A paper describes a structure:
Here we show that components of a (PUL) from Bacteroides caccae have activities consistent with comprising a unique pathway for depolymerization of chondroitin sulfate, a common GAG. After prior desulfation by an endo-sulfatase, BcSulf, to produce unsulfated chondroitin from chondroitin sulfate, the depolymerization pathway begins with the activity of a polysaccharide lyase from family 35, BcPL35. BcPL35 activity is coupled with BcGH88, an exo-β-uronyl hydrolase, and presumably BcGH109, a confirmed α/β-N-acetylgalactosaminidase. The most unique feature of the pathway is a β-D-glucuronate dehydratase, BcGDH, which we show through structural and functional analyses primes saturated non-reducing end β-D-glucuronate residues for hydrolysis by BcGH88.
BcPL35 crystallized in the spacegroup P212121 and we solved its structure to a resolution of 1.75 Å . The overall fold is a bi-domain structure of a (α/α)6 toroid fused to an anti-parallel β-sheet domain, thus generally similar to that of other PL families 8, 12, 15, 17, 21, 23, and 39 (37). The interface of the two domains is characterized by a deep groove that contains the putative catalytic machinery. The groove architecture of the active site that spans the full protein suggests endo-recognition of the substrate, which is consistent with the production of oligos with a degree of polymerization from two to six. The closest structural homologs of BcPL35 are GAGase II and GAGase VII, which are endo-acting PL35 enzymes from Spirosoma fluviale and Bacteroides intestinalis DSM 17393, respectively. The relatively high RMSD values appear to reflect that BcPL35 adopts a conformation with more widely separated N- and C-terminal domains. If the domains are separately overlapped with the respective domains in either GAGase II or VI the RMSD values drop to ∼1 Å, more accurately reflecting the high structural identity of the proteins. This did suggest, however, that there may be flexibility between the domains of BcPL35, which we interrogated by normal mode analysis using El Nemo. The primary predicted mode of flexibility involved a hinge motion at the separation between the domains resulting in ∼10 Å of movement between the domains with the crystal structure approximating an intermediate conformation. An analysis of conserved residues in the putative BcPL35 active site cleft allowed us to select six highly conserved residues for mutation to alanine: R76, E228, Y232, H387, Y413, and W419. Using cCH as a substrate, the activity for the R76 A, E228 A, H387 A, and Y413 A mutants was below detectable levels.
Numbering used by the authors: 12 to 593
């Protein structure tokens, strides 16, 4: 029988309740989280139902997501505390959304998330709801979810929301699996068919996590994909013996680690292209930490939970699962974050350096390859963010305004690259003869030495400088806990060409000959150009140029304009939290 015999069988089982109640009693953070979620439930009890109302885009997705949060939080509070105001509020919400004319299947994410919300509450309140509500909910799940997805599996093309390569596949198949399992005792044959088709089609999306767990589309996209993926993984682990092998797909084991490990210690996101912080507190992290035995991720997510509660941050629609999924594990003292690791991806390789995290002033550095012709990308191959003492000493200026004239004209001669934020002049990489990178090139990791005493990695950037250089290689080397060396090897096509080493910063800048001192809130960082001999740093403010740009304020640029003997040589810059890098 391919489901647990009794409700609740979805995400937080009956058998799991005893241990969760003990955590709430015995673990302060879990206890604080329980009280926090109970208080959220308290206001949800007295919050109006949402009218069926499409947004400017023609869908109700925001409303479905609202009900995921409302129904999950209310039903959790009823299971943990037994106060019938939580049950009755969930009953009212269930009847309300079942009396919607539809769950807007023309934009099927709407149906996927509404079915998820409804299935969870139905399952979690099964013995505690009026029979008339259970009858109506079962019929709505059957007609609006199970019947539709069975048709979609049989008739849908590869472009179908159940089969395409985008995260719609994961979200929709997940919502359908949860709906099917929620009413499985009444539709067991349908639930088995849906389980098998979900496992068949979901790899069309999830194969793109291979090999190392990188989500090219960025953290918001990752957060939506994996919040629903973890519901699926947990549900089929609990109900179907893990059949279908989704959990073992290459890259999935490492994907939460990627998200945690690519933040600076102070929490700053590598905001390249149009990436931005919005996905923070999805409970997916606790499923990954438990299923793949990564206490490092659990410990990091608990810190995020504390901050979410302390600063009253916005909640992921599935945030309520953080409590039943609570993972109290921590890494052992002996376990260390590697000094250097690389996350390979077909579009942009990601490089991550860590000096000894237990030594104050040690360096964190993250850098990227990339393909600038891809959507939303910048001419930023080789750029890096370095952090020490809680300060990001180099920057990424983020995306500019999507409304700008020619913002999408991404051809090599296109208007997109005239904007500072889009081109390499704002990024921490090379400009030859004060020109932009070639938009149709790429930078990628071509050599790695992650186990050396001074670990290093080499990027091939040649094709980003196609008309200017016959080869361009950038090597990052961690010389010690406090010091990174960047070696650019450039074979110029013209021996008089100038190689500009550029970096952006929000720190105060003092330059003198081949040295830079950066200052921020009394903390310092240092840079020294050691090759070619006699090179000089200058500095100047970044500024706006074209009307309609997001304001560019508080950014300073560093630039070393370097000639190379015979047009062939090296630019070598050492960077350290200590002034002496001899
Ligand atoms: Mg950028
Ligand atoms: Mg590669």
């Amino acid at each position: 029988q391919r489901f647990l015999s009794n409700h609740p069988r979805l995400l937080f089982t009956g058998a799991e309740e005893a241990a969760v109640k003990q955590l709430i009693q015995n673990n302060r953070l879990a206890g604080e989280l329980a009280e926090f979620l109970k208080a959220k439930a308290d206001t949800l009890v007295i919050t109006p139902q949402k009218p069926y109302l499409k947004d400017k885009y023609g869908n109700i997705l925001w409303t479905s997501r609202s009900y995921v949060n409302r129904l999950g939080t209310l039903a959790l509070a009823y299971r943990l505390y037994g106060e019938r105001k939580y049950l009755d509020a969930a009953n009212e919400a269930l009847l309300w959304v079942c009396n919607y004319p539809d769950w807007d299947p023309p934009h099927y994410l709407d149906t996927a998330e509404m079915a998820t919300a409804v299935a969870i509450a139905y399952d979690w309140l099964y013995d505690a709801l009026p029979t008339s509500t259970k009858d109506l909910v079962k019929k709505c799940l059957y007609e609006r979810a199970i019947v539709r997805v069975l048709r979609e599996y049989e008739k849908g093309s590869l472009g179908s929301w159940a089969k395409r390569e985008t995260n719609w596949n994961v979200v929709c198949n997940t919502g359908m699996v949860l709906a099917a399992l929620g009413i499985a005792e009444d539709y067991p044959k349908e639930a088995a068919v849906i389980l098998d088709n979900a496992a068949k089609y979901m790899p069309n999306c999830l194969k793109h996590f291979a090999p190392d767990g990188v989500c090219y589309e960025g953290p918001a996209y990752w957060g939506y994909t994996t919040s629903y993926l973890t519901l699926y993984l947990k549900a089929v682990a609990d109900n179907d013996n893990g059949k279908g092998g989704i959990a073992q797909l290459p890259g999935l084991e490492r994907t939460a680690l990627y998200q945690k490990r690519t933040l600076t210690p102070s929490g700053r996101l590598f905001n390249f292209g149009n990436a931005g912080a919005d996905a923070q507190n999805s409970p997916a992290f606790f499923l990954f930490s438990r299923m793949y035995n990564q206490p490092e991720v659990a410990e990091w997510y608990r810190e995020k939970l504390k901050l979410t509660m302390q600063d009253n941050l916005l909640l992921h629609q599935l945030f309520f699962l953080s409590l039943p999924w609570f993972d109290n594990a921590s890494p052992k003292k002996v376990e260390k974050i590697p000094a250097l690791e690389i996350y390979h991806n077909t579009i942009n390789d990601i490089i991550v350096f860590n000096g000894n995290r237990n030594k104050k002033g040690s360096l964190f550095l993250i850098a990227k390859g990339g393909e600038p012709r891809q959507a939303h990308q910048h001419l930023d191959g080789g750029t890096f963010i370095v952090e020490s003492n809680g300060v990001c000493w180099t920057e990424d200026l983020g995306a500019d305004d999507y409304a700008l004239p020619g913002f999408w004209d991404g051809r090599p001669d296109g208007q997109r690259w005239k904007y500072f934020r889009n081109n390499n002049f704002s990024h921490n990489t090379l400009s030859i003869d004060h020109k932009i990178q070639y938009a149709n090139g790429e930078a990628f990791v071509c050599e790695e030495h992650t186990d050396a005493k001074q670990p290093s990695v080499k990027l091939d950037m040649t094709t980003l400088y196609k008309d200017q250089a016959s080869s361009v290689f950038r090597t990052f080397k961690l010389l010690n806990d406090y010091t990174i060396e960047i070696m650019d090897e450039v074979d110029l096509l013209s021996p008089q060409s100038i190689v500009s080493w550029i970096a952006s910063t929000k720190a105060q800048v003092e330059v003198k000959e081949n040295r830079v001192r950066l200052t921020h809130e009394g903390k310092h960082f240092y840079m020294e150009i050691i090759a070619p001999a006699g090179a000089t740093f200058k500095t100047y403010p970044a500024k706006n140029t074209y009307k309609g740009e997001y304001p560019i304020e508080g950014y300073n640029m560093l630039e070393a304009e370097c000639g190379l003997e015979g047009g062939k040589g090296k630019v070598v810059v050492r960077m350290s939290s200590k002034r002496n890098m001899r």
